[PDB]
Design a protein around this ligand. Structure first.
Ligand SMILES: [Cl-]
Ligand SMILES: [Cl-]
Ligand SMILES: [Cl-]
Ligand SMILES: [Cl-]
Ligand SMILES: [Cl-]
Ligand SMILES: [Cl-]
Ligand SMILES: [Cl-]
Ligand SMILES: [Cl-]
Ligand SMILES: [Cl-]
Ligand SMILES: [Cl-]
Ligand SMILES: [Cl-]
Ligand SMILES: [Cl-]
Ligand SMILES: [Cl-]
Ligand SMILES: [Cl-]
Ligand SMILES: [Cl-]
Ligand SMILES: [Cl-]
Ligand code: NA
Ligand code: NA
Ligand code: NA
Ligand code: NA
Ligand code: NA
Ligand code: NA
Ligand code: NA
Ligand code: NA
Lengths: 345, 345
């Protein structure tokens, strides 16, 4: 019935190589901030309001034509969205995709360019809806993929083009379900990956085409589990990455594909652990990046191939640190006053 | 009526992070070779025949479901192809897509997952054909995009999803034509980018979403030209990268997005020049990677984020060198006996 403290912004590296960050202000509007230039340490726009009135984390996704699109639950509990009219232009108005949802939305593009959105319903099953044509409306009707879930869902694509969704179940195990063909409405049954998880799951694709899922465990360590064959079962056992974490974990890939995980520690600093040597190499010990943070961190690789990490500060502004040749940069403030609007806490 | 010596293999980093290389043997069959493991320096399969009888460079492309597909002109001058039945499985038979073509095929996926293939016709115009549905046959009818071209064409996608094709014209200038909308059959007119080029052009997308085109000039230097705005004109002037090159250039992106160009030099060694500092930084002087090569080089970034470069040797085998922390590795031989099967020489 609870999860580790959430990430509170959605961030992407856009089609022109600039990071762009989306969050929620105290009066429930979505705000965004973007780099002026496609480089680590670029000046930022500052926060600009996309208006709306949201009751979930707003989640941005890039259409296959490069246009950003933000999805969020509205005050009426419908799924709403707003999109760029062109990659380097302004935004539509907020429009409703209806339904009644009870989680943050999770988004992925099918191999045919149609976005598909997954969200928990009032019945605690996973529901979904999709664009009927590539990178465009109109959208399909809502339908259910069943299950009973207790965390925000997350979706990824397999290296063979099949979407796969992960969520915590009523028993606190990690569950998943997958497309049996790309672009299709043919799905598997829900299957348990076992474990006991106390955060939303995070999923990423490895350099070698396997899904790998991360989540906080019952012992507050970071745990992970992965496909042992490219786009295929069986899965590994759950394996611990140790640490003691007090937020959801965030994961990104370095530019050499080494995975790196980030989370708040018991001292409220940002901590991280990373694969060493290569993308098949052993994980480092947890090490501190300092800061005093009041959310999970959010990690992304920028256009210079460096990881940048965003986290809310004690002042409720969004702060930022990034990799340097030697080390990491000191935390800098991007201002704003942000809230955790997660539909599941 | 001629072009600089061509690249003689087609290489990709596949859905499971392994490099895979395609070439042509002395009896006109297509052969391929792949890394066992997703890492720099992996053992290789060795050469395996995909049979066929080709009269162009064979060009591999990855469908949006991860399956490889190889395109080549047949002995009957039709476009032929062969594809993986699944990403980690075997291949179909060679099948004909008809037409009569007079260049190597150039391939890209539209944002809706449909591959589109461009090839010069008997009239020296650019013709095209596409999959009617994402990552699958059947294919459309052939049609023409007009123009009069004197090099192999190359296609890329803009950061807004619009395909764009580049080719040398009768006047030896660089010409181009583009989709006016993603996934569409609406194209612009051919427009000249001027210059005088003496190789096939090479095109790549920058980290900041601009197309940048490279080609040998009339003075045998490497020249380049780029979109000055993301997915948009106007283009820059032609600018020289200096050097004296005796093959077509090859270009790839380092894992921090710095572009790096490769070509054979006057001493028949492999030479290279790269952006320094960042993807917006100045280009280095040309420096040697040694070797004695009998083709243009072919460059690709591997699953460890390192560039690997392939080139035919004096013995007609394919040789290989890659980036190390300090330097580059000594050339090693992958064997085989390869030919330049380019439909335009
Ligand atoms: Cl607000
Ligand atoms: Cl609005
Ligand atoms: Cl509906
Ligand atoms: Cl995730
Ligand atoms: Cl540790
Ligand atoms: Cl990038
Ligand atoms: Cl600091
Ligand atoms: Cl809050
Ligand atoms: Cl042969
Ligand atoms: Cl065959
Ligand atoms: Cl036809
Ligand atoms: Cl190219
Ligand atoms: Cl020089
Ligand atoms: Cl890779
Ligand atoms: Cl050597
Ligand atoms: Cl030859
Ligand atoms: Na942008
Ligand atoms: Na980008
Ligand atoms: Na996801
Ligand atoms: Na999340
Ligand atoms: Na492969
Ligand atoms: Na790959
Ligand atoms: Na191309
Ligand atoms: Na080429």
């Amino acid at each position: 019935s609870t999860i580790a403290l959430s990430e509170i912004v959605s961030v992407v590296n856009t089609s022109d190589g600039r990071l762009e960050v989306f969050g929620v202000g105290t009066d429930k509007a979505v705000w965004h901030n973007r780099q002026m230039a496609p480089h680590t340490g670029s000046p930022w726009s500052g926060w600009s309001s996309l208006k709306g009135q949201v009751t979930s984390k707003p989640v941005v996704y890039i259409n296959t034509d490069g246009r950003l699109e933000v999805f969020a639950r509205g005050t009426d509990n419908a799924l709403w969205h707003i999109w760029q009219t062109a990659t380097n232009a302004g935004w539509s108005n907020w429009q409703s995709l209806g339904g009644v949802i009870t989680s943050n939305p999770a988004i992925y593009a099918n191999t045919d360019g149609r976005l598909e959105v997954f969200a928990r319903g009032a019945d605690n099953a996973l529901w979904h809806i999709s664009q009927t044509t590539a990178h465009s409306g109109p959208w399909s009707s809502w339908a259910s993929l069943n299950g009973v879930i207790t965390s925000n869902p997350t979706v990824h694509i397999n290296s063979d083009g099949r979407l796969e969704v992960f969520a915590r179940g009523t028993d606190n195990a990690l569950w998943h379900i997958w497309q049996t063909a790309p672009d299709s409405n043919l799905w598997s049954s829900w299957e348990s990956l076992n474990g006991i998880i106390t955060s939303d799951p995070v999923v990423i694709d490895t350099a070698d085409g396997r899904l790998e899922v991360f989540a906080r465990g019952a012992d507050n360590a970071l745990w992970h589990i992965w496909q042992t064959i490219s786009h295929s079962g069986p899965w590994s056992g759950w394996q611990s990455l140790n640490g003691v974490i007090t937020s959801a974990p965030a994961v990104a890939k370095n530019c050499d594909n080494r995975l790196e995980a980030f989370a708040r520690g018991t001292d409220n600093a940002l901590w991280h652990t990373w694969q060493t040597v290569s993308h098949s190499g052993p994980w480092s010990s947890w090490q501190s990046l300092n800061g005093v943070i009041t959310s999970a961190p959010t990690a992304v690789r920028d256009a210079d191939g460096r990881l940048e990490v965003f986290a809310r500060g004690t002042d409720n502004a969004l702060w930022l640190t990034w990799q340097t040749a030697s080390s990491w940069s000191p935390w800098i403030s991007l201002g704003g006053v942000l809230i955790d609007a997660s539909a599941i806490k």
